[PDB]
Short mmCIF file of all heavy atoms in Angstrom, two decimals:
data_model
loop_
_atom_site.label_atom_id
_atom_site.label_comp_id
_atom_site.label_asym_id
_atom_site.label_seq_id
_atom_site.Cartn_x
_atom_site.Cartn_y
_atom_site.Cartn_z
N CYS A 164 83.78 -5.20 -55.59
CA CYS A 164 82.44 -4.74 -55.23
C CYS A 164 81.51 -4.71 -56.43
O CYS A 164 80.36 -5.12 -56.33
CB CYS A 164 82.50 -3.34 -54.62
SG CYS A 164 83.50 -3.20 -53.13
N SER A 165 81.99 -4.20 -57.57
CA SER A 165 81.22 -4.15 -58.79
C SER A 165 80.77 -5.52 -59.26
O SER A 165 79.89 -5.62 -60.10
CB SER A 165 82.00 -3.44 -59.86
OG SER A 165 81.44 -3.65 -61.14
N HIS A 166 81.39 -6.60 -58.75
CA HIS A 166 81.09 -7.97 -59.18
C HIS A 166 80.49 -8.80 -58.07
O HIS A 166 80.42 -10.03 -58.20
CB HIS A 166 82.32 -8.63 -59.75
CG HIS A 166 82.72 -8.16 -61.10
ND1 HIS A 166 81.81 -7.92 -62.10
CD2 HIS A 166 83.93 -7.87 -61.64
CE1 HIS A 166 82.42 -7.50 -63.19
NE2 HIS A 166 83.71 -7.46 -62.93
N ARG A 167 80.06 -8.18 -56.99
CA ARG A 167 79.35 -8.89 -55.90
C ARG A 167 77.86 -8.72 -56.03
O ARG A 167 77.18 -8.13 -55.20
CB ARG A 167 79.86 -8.40 -54.54
CG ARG A 167 79.35 -9.18 -53.37
CD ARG A 167 79.85 -8.55 -52.07
NE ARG A 167 81.30 -8.45 -52.02
CZ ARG A 167 81.97 -7.61 -51.25
NH1 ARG A 167 81.32 -6.78 -50.47
NH2 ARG A 167 83.28 -7.61 -51.28
N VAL A 168 77.31 -9.24 -57.13
CA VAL A 168 75.94 -9.03 -57.53
C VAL A 168 75.03 -10.01 -56.82
O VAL A 168 75.28 -11.23 -56.85
CB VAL A 168 75.80 -9.13 -59.05
CG1 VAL A 168 76.44 -10.37 -59.54
CG2 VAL A 168 74.34 -9.11 -59.45
N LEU A 169 73.97 -9.51 -56.19
CA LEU A 169 73.07 -10.36 -55.44
C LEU A 169 72.21 -11.20 -56.37
O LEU A 169 72.32 -12.42 -56.42
CB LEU A 169 72.17 -9.52 -54.53
CG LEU A 169 72.81 -8.64 -53.46
CD1 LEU A 169 71.74 -8.01 -52.62
CD2 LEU A 169 73.78 -9.43 -52.62
N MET A 170 71.33 -10.54 -57.12
CA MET A 170 70.52 -11.19 -58.14
C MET A 170 70.91 -10.66 -59.49
O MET A 170 71.52 -9.58 -59.62
CB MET A 170 69.02 -10.94 -57.91
CG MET A 170 68.61 -9.49 -58.06
SD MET A 170 66.83 -9.24 -57.97
CE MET A 170 66.30 -10.08 -59.45
N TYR A 171 70.62 -11.43 -60.54
CA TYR A 171 71.11 -11.09 -61.86
C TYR A 171 70.02 -10.48 -62.72
O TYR A 171 68.81 -10.71 -62.48
CB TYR A 171 71.72 -12.31 -62.56
CG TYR A 171 73.13 -12.59 -62.10
CD1 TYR A 171 73.37 -13.47 -61.07
CD2 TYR A 171 74.21 -11.98 -62.73
CE1 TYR A 171 74.67 -13.72 -60.64
CE2 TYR A 171 75.49 -12.23 -62.32
CZ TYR A 171 75.72 -13.10 -61.29
OH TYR A 171 77.01 -13.34 -60.88
N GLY A 172 70.42 -9.72 -63.73
CA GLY A 172 69.48 -9.07 -64.61
C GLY A 172 68.84 -10.01 -65.61
O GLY A 172 67.92 -9.61 -66.33
N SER A 173 69.28 -11.27 -65.65
CA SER A 173 68.60 -12.28 -66.44
C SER A 173 67.51 -12.98 -65.64
O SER A 173 66.43 -13.25 -66.16
CB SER A 173 69.59 -13.34 -66.95
OG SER A 173 69.77 -14.33 -65.98
N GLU A 174 67.77 -13.23 -64.34
CA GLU A 174 66.81 -13.90 -63.46
C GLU A 174 65.70 -12.91 -63.12
O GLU A 174 65.60 -12.40 -62.00
CB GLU A 174 67.50 -14.44 -62.23
CG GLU A 174 66.58 -15.13 -61.25
CD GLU A 174 66.97 -14.89 -59.81
OE1 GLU A 174 68.08 -14.36 -59.60
OE2 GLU A 174 66.17 -15.20 -58.92
N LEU A 175 64.86 -12.64 -64.10
CA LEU A 175 63.79 -11.67 -63.96
C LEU A 175 62.58 -12.28 -63.29
O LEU A 175 62.29 -13.47 -63.42
CB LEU A 175 63.41 -11.11 -65.33
CG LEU A 175 62.97 -12.14 -66.40
CD1 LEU A 175 61.49 -12.39 -66.28
CD2 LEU A 175 63.34 -11.62 -67.77
N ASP A 176 61.87 -11.44 -62.54
CA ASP A 176 60.77 -11.87 -61.70
C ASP A 176 59.67 -12.58 -62.53
O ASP A 176 59.68 -12.57 -63.76
CB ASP A 176 60.15 -10.65 -60.98
CG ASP A 176 59.18 -11.06 -59.88
OD1 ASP A 176 58.23 -11.83 -60.16
OD2 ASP A 176 59.37 -10.60 -58.74
N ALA A 177 58.75 -13.24 -61.81
CA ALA A 177 57.66 -13.92 -62.48
C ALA A 177 56.59 -12.93 -62.95
O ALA A 177 56.05 -13.08 -64.05
CB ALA A 177 57.02 -14.94 -61.51
N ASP A 178 56.28 -11.92 -62.14
CA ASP A 178 55.35 -10.87 -62.55
C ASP A 178 55.86 -10.07 -63.74
O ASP A 178 55.16 -9.12 -64.19
CB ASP A 178 55.09 -9.93 -61.38
CG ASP A 178 53.73 -9.23 -61.49
OD1 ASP A 178 53.20 -9.13 -62.61
OD2 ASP A 178 53.21 -8.77 -60.44
N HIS A 179 57.03 -10.38 -64.25
CA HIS A 179 57.68 -9.59 -65.28
C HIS A 179 57.02 -9.83 -66.63
O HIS A 179 57.01 -10.98 -67.11
CB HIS A 179 59.16 -9.94 -65.33
CG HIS A 179 59.97 -8.96 -66.13
ND1 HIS A 179 60.08 -9.02 -67.50
CD2 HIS A 179 60.74 -7.92 -65.74
CE1 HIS A 179 60.87 -8.05 -67.91
NE2 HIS A 179 61.26 -7.36 -66.88
N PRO A 180 56.45 -8.83 -67.30
CA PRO A 180 56.05 -9.01 -68.69
C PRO A 180 57.23 -9.49 -69.51
O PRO A 180 58.21 -8.78 -69.69
CB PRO A 180 55.58 -7.60 -69.10
CG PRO A 180 56.10 -6.68 -68.06
CD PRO A 180 56.17 -7.48 -66.80
N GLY A 181 57.11 -10.71 -70.00
CA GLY A 181 58.26 -11.39 -70.58
C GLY A 181 58.78 -12.54 -69.74
O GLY A 181 59.74 -13.20 -70.16
N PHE A 182 58.20 -12.78 -68.58
CA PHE A 182 58.55 -13.97 -67.79
C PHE A 182 58.17 -15.24 -68.54
O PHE A 182 58.77 -16.30 -68.31
CB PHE A 182 57.85 -13.92 -66.45
CG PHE A 182 58.05 -15.15 -65.63
CD1 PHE A 182 59.21 -15.35 -64.89
CD2 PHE A 182 57.07 -16.12 -65.57
CE1 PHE A 182 59.37 -16.49 -64.13
CE2 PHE A 182 57.23 -17.26 -64.81
CZ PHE A 182 58.39 -17.45 -64.10
N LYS A 183 57.20 -15.15 -69.45
CA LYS A 183 56.75 -16.29 -70.26
C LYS A 183 57.17 -16.15 -71.71
O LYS A 183 56.49 -16.63 -72.61
CB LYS A 183 55.23 -16.46 -70.15
CG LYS A 183 54.72 -16.83 -68.78
CD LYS A 183 55.55 -17.99 -68.20
CE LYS A 183 54.83 -19.31 -68.38
NZ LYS A 183 55.29 -20.33 -67.42
N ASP A 184 58.30 -15.49 -71.93
CA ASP A 184 58.80 -15.24 -73.28
C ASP A 184 59.98 -16.16 -73.58
O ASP A 184 60.45 -16.90 -72.73
CB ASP A 184 59.21 -13.79 -73.44
CG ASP A 184 59.49 -13.39 -74.87
OD1 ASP A 184 60.42 -14.01 -75.47
OD2 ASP A 184 58.81 -12.53 -75.42
N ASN A 185 60.43 -16.12 -74.83
CA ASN A 185 61.52 -16.95 -75.28
C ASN A 185 62.68 -16.19 -75.94
O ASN A 185 63.81 -16.59 -75.77
CB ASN A 185 61.01 -18.00 -76.29
CG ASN A 185 60.04 -17.42 -77.31
OD1 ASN A 185 58.89 -17.12 -77.00
ND2 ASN A 185 60.48 -17.28 -78.55
N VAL A 186 62.39 -15.11 -76.67
CA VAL A 186 63.44 -14.34 -77.30
C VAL A 186 63.98 -13.26 -76.36
O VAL A 186 65.20 -13.06 -76.26
CB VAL A 186 62.91 -13.70 -78.62
CG1 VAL A 186 62.84 -14.74 -79.70
CG2 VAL A 186 61.55 -13.08 -78.38
N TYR A 187 63.11 -12.58 -75.64
CA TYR A 187 63.53 -11.60 -74.65
C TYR A 187 64.50 -12.23 -73.65
O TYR A 187 65.63 -11.75 -73.49
CB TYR A 187 62.30 -11.03 -73.94
CG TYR A 187 62.62 -9.87 -73.00
CD1 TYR A 187 62.73 -8.58 -73.48
CD2 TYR A 187 62.82 -10.10 -71.64
CE1 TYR A 187 63.02 -7.52 -72.64
CE2 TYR A 187 63.10 -9.06 -70.80
CZ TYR A 187 63.20 -7.78 -71.29
OH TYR A 187 63.49 -6.74 -70.44
N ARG A 188 64.07 -13.31 -73.01
CA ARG A 188 64.87 -13.91 -71.96
C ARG A 188 66.24 -14.36 -72.43
O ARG A 188 67.08 -14.78 -71.61
CB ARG A 188 64.11 -15.10 -71.37
CG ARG A 188 62.75 -14.76 -70.84
CD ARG A 188 62.37 -15.65 -69.64
NE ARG A 188 63.31 -15.51 -68.55
CZ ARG A 188 63.11 -16.02 -67.34
NH1 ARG A 188 62.00 -16.69 -67.08
NH2 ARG A 188 64.01 -15.84 -66.39
N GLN A 189 66.50 -14.28 -73.73
CA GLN A 189 67.80 -14.68 -74.27
C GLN A 189 68.72 -13.50 -74.56
O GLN A 189 69.93 -13.71 -74.73
CB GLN A 189 67.63 -15.52 -75.54
CG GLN A 189 66.67 -16.68 -75.38
CD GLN A 189 67.12 -17.63 -74.28
OE1 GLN A 189 68.31 -17.77 -74.02
NE2 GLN A 189 66.16 -18.30 -73.66
N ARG A 190 68.17 -12.27 -74.65
CA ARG A 190 69.00 -11.09 -74.76
C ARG A 190 69.38 -10.55 -73.40
O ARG A 190 70.47 -10.00 -73.23
CB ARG A 190 68.24 -10.02 -75.56
CG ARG A 190 69.04 -8.82 -75.96
CD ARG A 190 68.40 -8.15 -77.16
NE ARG A 190 68.99 -6.87 -77.50
CZ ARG A 190 70.22 -6.70 -77.95
NH1 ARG A 190 71.01 -7.75 -78.12
NH2 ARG A 190 70.65 -5.48 -78.24
N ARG A 191 68.53 -10.73 -72.39
CA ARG A 191 68.82 -10.46 -71.02
C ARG A 191 69.96 -11.30 -70.49
O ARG A 191 70.46 -11.02 -69.40
CB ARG A 191 67.57 -10.65 -70.16
CG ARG A 191 66.61 -9.50 -70.21
CD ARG A 191 67.15 -8.32 -69.40
NE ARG A 191 66.07 -7.52 -68.86
CZ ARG A 191 65.67 -7.55 -67.58
NH1 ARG A 191 66.26 -8.38 -66.73
NH2 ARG A 191 64.69 -6.79 -67.17
N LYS A 192 70.34 -12.33 -71.21
CA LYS A 192 71.55 -13.08 -70.89
C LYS A 192 72.77 -12.60 -71.63
O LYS A 192 73.87 -12.60 -71.05
CB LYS A 192 71.36 -14.58 -71.20
CG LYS A 192 72.14 -15.49 -70.28
CD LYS A 192 72.00 -16.93 -70.73
CE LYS A 192 72.91 -17.24 -71.89
NZ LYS A 192 74.35 -17.11 -71.55
N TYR A 193 72.63 -12.15 -72.89
CA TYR A 193 73.73 -11.46 -73.55
C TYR A 193 74.20 -10.27 -72.75
O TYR A 193 75.40 -10.01 -72.62
CB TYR A 193 73.28 -11.04 -74.95
CG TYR A 193 74.22 -10.06 -75.59
CD1 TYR A 193 75.56 -10.33 -75.77
CD2 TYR A 193 73.74 -8.83 -76.07
CE1 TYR A 193 76.42 -9.45 -76.37
CE2 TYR A 193 74.60 -7.94 -76.66
CZ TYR A 193 75.93 -8.24 -76.81
OH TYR A 193 76.78 -7.35 -77.41
#
């Protein structure tokens, strides 16, 4: 259950401050 994740914390929305970023979007994957 803990691993049946619908959407991921890296796949952040478009309205997200940082949707047009380059360094942020790479820590959200770490």
Side-chain angles (χ1 to χ4, degrees):
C164 301
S165 166
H166 285 319
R167 188 183 303 157
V168 49
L169 301 185
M170 65 173 294
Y171 279 93
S173 87
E174 179 217 348
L175 58 87
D176 192 306
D178 205 339
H179 194 277
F182 174 81
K183 294 313 261 203
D184 190 300
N185 44 287
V186 284
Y187 187 84
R188 304 211 59 170
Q189 309 300 331
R190 191 156 170 68
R191 280 286 209 103
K192 211 185 79 63
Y193 166 56

